[PDB]
Amino acid sequence: LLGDFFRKSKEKIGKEFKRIVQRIKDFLRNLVPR
Ligand code: NA
């Protein structure tokens, strides 16, 4: 129960990291004029 709460807190940090990095990648790629 409590262990799962702490684990999910760690997992959420990981998910947010991934989402932010993906957003940055997409943004940078979208900057290149066509
Ligand atoms: Na963008």
Author numbering: 1 to 34
The authors write:
LL-37 is an extensively studied peptide with particular relevance in human innate immunity. LL-37 is produced as a precursor protein in human cells (e.g. leukocytes or neutrophils) and processed during its secretion to the skin, lungs, or reproductive tract. The active peptide carries a surplus of positive charge, which is attributed to interactions with the LPS or LTA of the bacterial cell wall, and negatively charged lipids of in vivo cytoplasmic membranes. We determined its atomic structure in solution and the putative membrane interaction states. Together the structures in the absence and presence of detergents revealed discrete detergent binding sites at the dimer interface indicating the presence of in vivo lipid binding sites.
Our first crystals yielded a monomeric structure at atomic resolution (termed LL-37DPC-1) obtained under conditions comprising artificially high MPD concentrations (70% MPD). The second structure (termed LL-372) obtained in the absence of detergents displays an anti-parallel dimer formed by two α-helices without supercoiling. The monomers are identical to LL-37DPC-1 with each amphipathic helix extending to ~5 nm. Intramolecular stabilization of the monomer is provided by backbone H-bonds and salt bridges (formed between Asp4 and Arg7, Glu16 and Arg19 and Asp26 and Arg29, Gln22 and Asp26).
